[PDB]
């Protein structure tokens, strides 16, 4: 159910999060159970609980919050000094 829907499910929690940083509101509850089902499925294993979360969504995660705030900081600095940035 995830790893097969691992190339859309990711794809689109991505899409929705930084619809958020958008600054739209989208469904807290539906996105917080989804992020949180995928540490809950290695609830089992002993070592590396989170490898999952991790390799899965964390990773995706960081590699996208980070060409999103640098295509933000290259945004804030066109029209604003750093008084205001």
């Given amino acids: 159910m995830v790893e097969p829907l691992q190339a859309i499910l990711i794809r689109m929690l991505l899409r929705e999060i930084k619809n958020d940083r958008g600054g739209e509101d989208p469904n807290q509850k539906v996105?917080?159970?989804?992020?949180?089902?995928?540490?809950?499925?290695?609830?089992?294993?002993?070592?590396?609980?989170?490898?999952?979360?991790?390799?899965?969504?964390?990773?995706?995660?960081?590699?996208?919050?980070?060409?999103?705030?640098?295509?933000?900081a290259s945004n804030l600095l066109q029209e604003s000094n750093c008084s205001q940035y």
Avoid: C, D
């Fill in 31 to 72: 996105i917080h159970g989804v992020i949180n089902s995928f540490v809950h499925v290695e609830q089992y294993k002993k070592k590396f609980p989170l490898k999952f979360y991790q390799e899965i969504f964390e990773s995706p995660f960081l590699t996208e919050t980070g060409e999103y705030y640098k295509q933000e």
